[PDB]
Symmetry: C3
Subunit: 66 residues, 3 copies
């Protein structure tokens, strides 16, 4: 898709206003998407920590039985 | 809060200049905040790796004693 | 580096157009860099998970031999 820039100064200002509103939206969206990815990675890390802590309890039980 | 856009072309250009300076700031801020979150997650991961490596040394000691 | 803003309205509009094209580029770049950092952290997490799962298999072998 492709449209010529306005030549009229007022029209050009209004187009730039629109592009500023669009860039504000893009910034917010890709911040949210990045937040979501990080929280998924955190959830995966914390599950690993939980599983490893259970293994440690299993190893400690084994040491009792030696 | 709400203020009408300037009608004068020069005033409108100067407002858009201001909004561009403000968007540059927002971009930098939310990049830094995202960096900080990632480095905290990395610190948590590396501590886990350290703890797991210690468990491995404990398991290896146990194997000696069998 | 430092250059005075254009005074002419059309020239000023064209400068602001340029800065909008530059901010679009900065946004994309720092999104990609942030993506790259996250995927490296994910690779490190998944390797840890792999190593821990191997330790669990080693512990389970030890339990057989008790
Ligand atoms: Zn949002
Ligand atoms: Zn955690
Ligand atoms: Zn679970
Ligand atoms: Zn127990
Ligand atoms: Zn900064
Ligand atoms: Zn690391
Ligand atoms: Zn520690
Ligand atoms: Zn030892
Ligand atoms: Zn890209
Ligand atoms: Zn994974
Ligand atoms: Zn490996
Ligand atoms: Zn086996």
């Amino acid at each position: 898709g492709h449209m010529e820039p306005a030549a009229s100064s007022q029209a050009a200002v209004e187009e730039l206003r629109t592009q500023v509103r669009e860039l504000r939206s893009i910034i917010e969206t890709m911040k949210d998407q990045q937040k979501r990815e990080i929280k998924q990675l955190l959830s995966e890390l914390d599950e690993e920590k939980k599983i490893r802590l259970r293994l440690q309890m299993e190893v400690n039980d084994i040491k009792k039985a030696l």
